């Protein structure tokens, strides 16, 4: 049985926003039909409550969930179970889907990637599909649902002639498109990092490579639950979703399949990049140790024999071999050049 | 039947037999005084702080009608937390923890609970625990503990243990903060040793916290007749607290693993730098050693007299070859 969680050092019933963004708050509603649409932006929640019992589909979008009062009021007026609200306010979560007899609750993730600082930031977006309302919950201004807004505003496509199910499909489709553009950004970043890794192998290069590794692991742990959500969307059809609009969900599922495969290929490529880095650094170390060993090989035996002739037994044939010393230097040079020739034979 | 642990120093048996009207306590070391408490209708709490003294634990085992196998379970220390259900009593194995801020060393102590009808029994290996708030609540009639049965006493004990786990998590949180700051900027061999030790501590903590979640889940989900149905939400709360602790442990594990990965990422550069240093120092000294050795040879025909003053020219060529090698090392950025 579903139940609100008790948390230590926190009053029993309180709901907490588990996030970092508290800058801004906004409520945006588009009530659209076949004939006419209306849209407005507001802060009052009473201005948007009465749409619960409305005929034409409406899209209530709430930006800024640090306002837990607004989330609680909306959930109470719309009859949302408190655990679903607690899931909404929790952002340390994976994408999920939950089916209820009156509404369906979906958790998705949005990603903005920056070339500078190579930072992959996630924003959680929640969708509640009700009788004729799709509830949009976000943390901060800036989303990817502008195409759906434009289609609603200029009667493009077929969205104006359908119900809220098509609106849910459209929002999820736009989010998957953002996933595609993020994957393209990852292409660009991999290209830059692979160009730099071959000729400039340093510590910041491998810091960037491991950052990319962690980013891709997070992307995989995000895409797999998304694929499960879409699979449950089209192949366990709830009463809220019509018999139509299921092919569209299947298309979104196919797109998720493609995204997952691309993520796996990215992981393989980045592993190859790390191997390339290690090979390059090892080759430089080989070069330096090669010069060290050539010097040591040429000089240590020669220093040894210089020490042999630098000692004193008082009964040694030290002279009279055509002064001997020129012969000693001749032997020095002969063995030195033989060692040089051997190194050339080894191509060092 | 042997105490497998290390703490075999101190012994004392505390008793807190309590009821709404009044409460009675006595700290005694004689076995016979703590026996007849199973017949008391009022809830009773017996605390045996000596485990190496196997005589007393065996005596209370055959006096309370508890199987010798669970007696061996108390006498065994290297054992993850577990719960067992018997028709007459319930057997629970738990662990306490002590963390030293200075030494970064985490040590564990086992506490074993045998809850029978209207009586709870502990078993500790050492003096010192965290059940003191439960004792104070039993004494000065603070909460609802004195007005309820022994299963509520078990709940209070487990709640105190989970609270101690929260405090330990606070200490580990401070340690991870400082260690992450030190590793990110200005790392050191001591910092790597600290990182390894903290990773080991977190591994132990995860391995001892997951069975605790399992135990609390089995406690509230399917309730044996020993636990009343009214006390289920309390054990449920403790289960939620254990969930919180395990989530924090997992997050800390991820942070520490990333800290290790970033450090080990850059070892080959260290190899290359040590190679460069050694090669520079060896290359600019072996030829000089050679020429000094040749001119130190004990032959008799060495023009070591006059000849442009002798040592000035050899010092000059040593300096010239040294600076030439230095210039050659200036290329390629050595």
């Amino acid at each position, epitope marked *: 049985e579903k139940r609100l969680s008790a*948390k*230590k*050092g*926190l*009053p*029993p*019933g*309180t709901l*907490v*926003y*588990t*996030g*970092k963004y*508290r*800058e801004d708050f906004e409520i945006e509603v588009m009530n659209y039909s076949i004939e006419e649409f209306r849209e407005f932006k507001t*802060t*009052d929640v*009473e201005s948007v409550l009465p749409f619960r019992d409305s005929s034409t589909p409406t899209w209530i979008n709430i930006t800024g969930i*640090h306002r*837990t*009062d607004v989330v*609680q009021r909306v959930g109470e007026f719309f009859g949302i179970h408190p655990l679903v609200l607690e899931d909404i306010l929790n952002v*340390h979560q994976r994408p999920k889907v939950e089916f209820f007899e009156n509404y369906v609750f979906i958790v998705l993730k949005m990603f903005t990637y920056d070339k500078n600082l190579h930072e992959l930031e996630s924003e959680q977006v929640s969708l509640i599909l009700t009788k004729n309302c799709v509830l949009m919950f976000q943390e901060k201004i800036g989303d990817v649902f502008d195409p759906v807004r434009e289609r609603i505003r200029y009667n493009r496509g077929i969205i104006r002639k359908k119900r809220a199910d098509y609106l849910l499909y459209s929002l999820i489709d736009a989010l998957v498109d953002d996933y595609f553009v993020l994957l393209e950004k990852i292409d660009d970043e991999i290209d830059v990092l692979e160009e730099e890794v071959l000729e400039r192998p340093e510590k910041e290069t491998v810091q960037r490579t491991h950052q990319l590794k962690r980013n891709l692991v997070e992307l995989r742990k995000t895409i797999w639950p998304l694929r499960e959500v879409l699979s449950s969307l089209y192949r366990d059809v709830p009463p809220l979703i019509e018999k139509e609009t299921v092919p569209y969900f299947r298309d979104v599922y196919d797109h998720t399949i493609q995204i997952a495969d691309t993520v796996e290929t990215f992981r393989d490529i980045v592993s190859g990049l790390l191997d390339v880095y290690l090979s390059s650094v090892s080759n430089k170390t080989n070069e330096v140790m090669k010069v060290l060993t050539i010097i040591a090989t040429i000089f240590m035996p020669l220093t040894f024999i210089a020490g042999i002739y630098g000692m004193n037994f008082e009964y040694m044939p030290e002279l009279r071999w055509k002064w001997g010393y020129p012969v000693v230097l001749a032997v020095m040079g002969v063995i030195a050049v033989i060692m040089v020739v051997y190194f050339k034979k080894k191509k060092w | 039947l042997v105490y497998t642990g290390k703490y075999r120093e101190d012994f004392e048996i505390e008793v807190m037999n309590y009821s709404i009207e009044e409460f009675r306590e006595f700290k005694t070391t004689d076995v016979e005084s703590v026996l007849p408490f199973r017949d008391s209708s009022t809830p009773t709490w017996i605390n045996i702080t000596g485990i190496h003294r196997t005589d007393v634990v065996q005596r209370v085992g055959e006096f309370f009608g508890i199987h010798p196998l669970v007696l061996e379970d108390i006498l065994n220390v290297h054992q993850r937390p577990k719960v067992e259900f018997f028709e007459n009593y319930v057997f629970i194995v738990l662990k306490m923890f002590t963390y030293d801020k200075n030494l970064h060393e985490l040590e564990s102590e086992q506490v074993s609970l045998i809850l029978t009808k209207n009586c709870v029994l502990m078993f500790q290996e050492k003096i010192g625990d965290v059940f003191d708030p439960v004792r104070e609540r039993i004494r000065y009639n603070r909460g609802i503990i004195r007005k309820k049965r022994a299963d509520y006493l078990l709940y209070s004990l487990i709640d105190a243990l989970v609270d101690d786990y*929260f*405090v330990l*998590l*606070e*200490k580990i*949180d*401070d*340690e991870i*903060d*400082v260690l992450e*700051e030190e590793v990110l900027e200005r790392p050191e061999k001591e910092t790597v040793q600290r990182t390894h030790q903290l990773k080991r501590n977190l591994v132990e903590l995860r391995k001892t916290i997951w069975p605790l979640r399992e135990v609390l889940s089995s406690l509230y989900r399917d309730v044996p007749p020993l636990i009343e149905k009214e006390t289920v939400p309390y054990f449920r709360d403790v289960y939620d607290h254990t969930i*919180q*602790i395990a*989530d*924090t442990v997992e*997050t800390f594990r991820d942070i520490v693993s990333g800290l290790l990965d970033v450090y080990l990422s850059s070892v080959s550069n260290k190899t290359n730098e040590v190679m460069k240093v050694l090669t520079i120092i060896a290359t600019i000294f072996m030829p000089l050693t050679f020429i000094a050795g040749i001119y130190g040879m004990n032959f008799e025909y060495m023009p070591e007299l006059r000849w442009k003053w002798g040592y000035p020219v050899v010092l000059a060529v040593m300096g010239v070859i040294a600076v030439i090698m230095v210039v050659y090392f200036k290329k390629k950025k050595w």
Partner: antibody
Framework: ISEVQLVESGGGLVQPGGSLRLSCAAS????????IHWVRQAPGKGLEWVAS????????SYADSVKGRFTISADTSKNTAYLQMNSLRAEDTAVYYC???????????????????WGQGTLVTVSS | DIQMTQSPSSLSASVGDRVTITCRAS??????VAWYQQKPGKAPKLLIY???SLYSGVPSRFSGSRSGTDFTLTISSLQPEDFATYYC?????????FGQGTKVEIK
């Protein structure tokens, strides 16, 4: 609708050992969704936290300096939090602020609260 | 009761300087530390929460960080309006406490 405002009322000169009650009217927000705090600042001294109420759950917390001597409570219908001060001492003389806070998140086990909106504060004088 | 020890208590600096206020806890306070500023005759104003996060509407010159049980508030570049008393606060326990204050004076 409207800005978030906190207004205190009830500050007055009370004889030592007596009693008085302070009101905290909440505007711009619902007292249930938030936690109301009382903060005491003695003349010439720093801030001291004195009380706390979580109206929706009814949970209360008191400082040891006033524990067993103060009582904090709220009316959800009136959108007002209260502070019943009795058995006052000479050291209770201070300006009493009313504040609103939210809970935020650090780790799974750790939480913290920060105070956003403060009232003007009313002065209580225990003397003569 | 966790004690917050805030030092210095009588800092003085000129406009455009750099102010550092350090604050220490008697025991572990897991990054649940906030900073407030109070001009004389007024109510406190929130500056930093979670020891690092900057409150909305607070000027960007204010900054905070945590080093274990040690917390610091920095005014990177002083302003004429940046002269007031600053306080600590721990909120890891149900019993929450303040620091004793730190007055930044005009030099």
């Amino acid at each position: 609708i409207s800005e978030v405002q906190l207004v205190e009322s009830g500050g007055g000169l009370v004889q030592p050992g007596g009693s008085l009650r302070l009101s905290c009217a909440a505007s711009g927000f619902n007292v249930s969704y938030y936690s109301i705090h009382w903060v005491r600042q003695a003349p010439g001294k720093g801030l001291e936290w004195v009380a706390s109420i979580s109206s929706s759950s009814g949970s209360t917390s008191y400082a040891d300096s006033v524990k067993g001597r103060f009582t904090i409570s709220a009316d959800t219908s009136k959108n007002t939090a209260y502070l019943q001060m009795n058995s006052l001492r000479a050291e209770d003389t201070a300006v009493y602020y009313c504040a609103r806070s939210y809970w935020y998140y650090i780790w799974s086990y750790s939480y913290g609260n920060a105070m956003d909106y403060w009232g003007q504060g009313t002065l209580v004088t225990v003397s003569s | 009761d966790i004690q917050m020890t805030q030092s210095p208590s009588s800092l003085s600096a000129s406009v455009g300087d750099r102010v550092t206020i350090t604050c220490r806890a008697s025991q572990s306070v897991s990054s649940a530390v906030a900073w407030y500023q109070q001009k004389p005759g007024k109510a406190p104003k929130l500056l930093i929460y979670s020891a690092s996060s900057l409150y909305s509407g607070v000027p960007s010159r204010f900054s905070g960080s945590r080093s274990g049980t040690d917390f610091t508030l920095t005014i990177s570049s002083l302003q004429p309006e940046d002269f007031a008393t600053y306080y600590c606060q721990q909120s890891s326990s149900s019993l929450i406490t303040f620091g004793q204050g730190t007055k930044v004076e005009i030099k």
